[PDB]
Amino acid sequence: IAQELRLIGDLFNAYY
Amino acid sequence: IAQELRLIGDLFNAYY
Amino acid sequence: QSNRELVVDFLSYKLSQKGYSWSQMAAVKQALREAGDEFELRYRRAFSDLTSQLHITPGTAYQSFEQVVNELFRDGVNWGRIVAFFSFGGALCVESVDKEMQVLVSRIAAWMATYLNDHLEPWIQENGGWDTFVELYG
Amino acid sequence: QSNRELVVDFLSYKLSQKGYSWSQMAAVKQALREAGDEFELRYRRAFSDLTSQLHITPGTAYQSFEQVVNELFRDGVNWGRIVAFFSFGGALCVESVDKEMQVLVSRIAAWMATYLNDHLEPWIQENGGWDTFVELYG
């Protein structure tokens, strides 16, 4: 769960 | 506006 | 305290998305949001859109507000009318801002809160409080 | 004060329905609600539903919470991760209650608010505060 949250989290941040 | 609000208002109350 | 506000909000939101409630002050807020949506709908189909009907002359917003409200509860109070009270106030804040009169928004909130406290609260207490309102509007 | 709360809520709601904002503390709350909805979506499609993945052993909820959070921000902080932080906490409150463990809901809120204050706030201040977060998530 921890790694998965980091992924979409980092994908969100890089998206903007 | 006043009479109209009273209508739907009273229709709501009687509905339940 | 701002940080906890953000946490209690969102958590309330996510709990409501699953039919749950953070507190049953939050269920009151939720039920009233939904009620206002339904009211503004059945008002729209039966007549016109509530916000479109609003045409506020400058420096007459208080008089306009107090006139409709005092007439709404002239002969009595009930839950459906209190819903109308909130929706009308909401429509007035939205009609303001639209006409670049944002200053009125805080003033309207003060008019609503004051009228709710002094005039409507006593009725609300005798009729089982806001908890009752949620039962009828589940 | 409960009556004004009901008025500021709803008014915030009705203003948001028309792309307006009561205050830009309310825009933060709004933007964060939406962000959490989008996060929980792209998390679901890419993997599994976040809430389903949760399986809380009794009396281990704090350890479970602190483990994921401390790992999430192990090497840094960013807005997208703070979104994950809220969503995960939200999923945990929803996974609780489901298993009849409502007592945890308030405790989770305390864990989130505390961690937000002590550990995340300093980062938030240096990166232009919560106002910046709203610009990126309009």
Side-chain angles (χ1 to χ4, degrees), chain A residues 1-6 8-10 12-16, chain B residues 1-6 8-10 12-16, chain C, chain D:
Chain A
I1 300 172
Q3 287 69 31
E4 294 169 46
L5 291 168
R6 283 167 55 86
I8 292 114
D10 286 337
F12 264 45
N13 203 65
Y15 181 96
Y16 301 94
Chain B
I1 300 172
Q3 287 69 31
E4 294 169 46
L5 291 168
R6 283 167 55 86
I8 292 114
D10 286 337
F12 264 45
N13 203 65
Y15 181 96
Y16 301 94
Chain C
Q1 74 289 60
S2 303
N3 277 339
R4 178 169 178 90
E5 275 189 61
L6 296 179
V7 173
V8 171
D9 204 276
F10 190 95
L11 284 184
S12 297
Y13 179 63
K14 292 290 146 187
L15 286 172
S16 78
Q17 283 178 327
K18 307 294 184 185
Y20 300 136
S21 178
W22 164 262
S23 68
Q24 252 160 333
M25 164 64 53
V28 178
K29 290 179 181 175
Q30 172 63 11
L32 193 60
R33 281 185 180 200
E34 292 179 8
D37 289 331
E38 179 60 23
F39 183 94
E40 290 166 11
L41 177 66
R42 282 174 61 174
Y43 187 106
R44 194 180 304 107
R45 79 182 306 194
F47 305 110
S48 315
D49 175 82
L50 179 56
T51 312
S52 69
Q53 291 189 350
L54 304 186
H55 307 276
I56 287 298
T57 306
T60 73
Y62 179 73
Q63 296 86 330
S64 305
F65 174 85
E66 284 294 312
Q67 187 216 46
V68 177
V69 171
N70 284 327
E71 183 55 36
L72 171 61
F73 301 106
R74 186 180 56 84
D75 50 24
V77 178
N78 59 73
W79 290 117
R81 287 183 184 179
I82 292 172
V83 172
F85 165 87
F86 276 93
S87 298
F88 168 69
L92 203 61
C93 286
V94 168
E95 171 62 9
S96 181
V97 189
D98 278 25
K99 313 312 174 193
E100 297 183 8
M101 294 189 292
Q102 295 82 354
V103 293
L104 294 176
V105 178
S106 61
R107 311 246 272 276
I108 294 165
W111 305 338
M112 293 180 70
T114 298
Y115 189 95
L116 186 61
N117 279 326
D118 303 25
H119 295 292
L120 293 174
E121 179 76 333
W123 176 94
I124 294 166
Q125 304 287 34
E126 230 300 302
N127 298 47
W130 279 104
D131 290 334
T132 308
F133 171 77
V134 180
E135 297 172 3
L136 310 180
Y137 298 78
Chain D
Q1 74 289 60
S2 303
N3 277 339
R4 178 169 178 90
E5 275 189 61
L6 296 179
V7 173
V8 171
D9 204 276
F10 190 95
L11 284 184
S12 297
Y13 179 63
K14 292 290 146 187
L15 286 172
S16 78
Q17 283 178 327
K18 307 294 184 185
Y20 300 136
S21 178
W22 164 262
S23 68
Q24 252 160 333
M25 164 64 53
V28 178
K29 290 179 181 175
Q30 172 63 11
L32 193 60
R33 281 185 180 200
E34 292 179 8
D37 289 331
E38 179 60 23
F39 183 94
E40 290 166 11
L41 177 66
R42 282 174 61 174
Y43 187 106
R44 194 180 304 107
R45 79 182 306 194
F47 305 110
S48 315
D49 175 82
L50 179 56
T51 312
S52 69
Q53 291 189 350
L54 304 186
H55 307 276
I56 287 298
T57 306
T60 73
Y62 179 73
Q63 296 86 330
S64 305
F65 174 85
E66 284 294 312
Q67 187 216 46
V68 177
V69 171
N70 284 327
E71 183 55 36
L72 171 61
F73 301 106
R74 186 180 56 84
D75 50 24
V77 178
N78 59 73
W79 290 117
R81 287 183 184 179
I82 292 172
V83 172
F85 165 87
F86 276 93
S87 298
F88 168 69
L92 203 61
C93 286
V94 168
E95 171 62 9
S96 181
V97 189
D98 278 25
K99 313 312 174 193
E100 297 183 8
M101 294 189 292
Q102 295 82 354
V103 293
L104 294 176
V105 178
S106 61
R107 311 246 272 276
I108 294 165
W111 305 338
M112 293 180 70
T114 298
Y115 189 95
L116 186 61
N117 279 326
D118 303 25
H119 295 292
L120 293 174
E121 179 76 333
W123 176 94
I124 294 166
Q125 304 287 34
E126 230 300 302
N127 298 47
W130 279 104
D131 290 334
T132 308
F133 171 77
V134 180
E135 297 172 3
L136 310 180
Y137 298 78

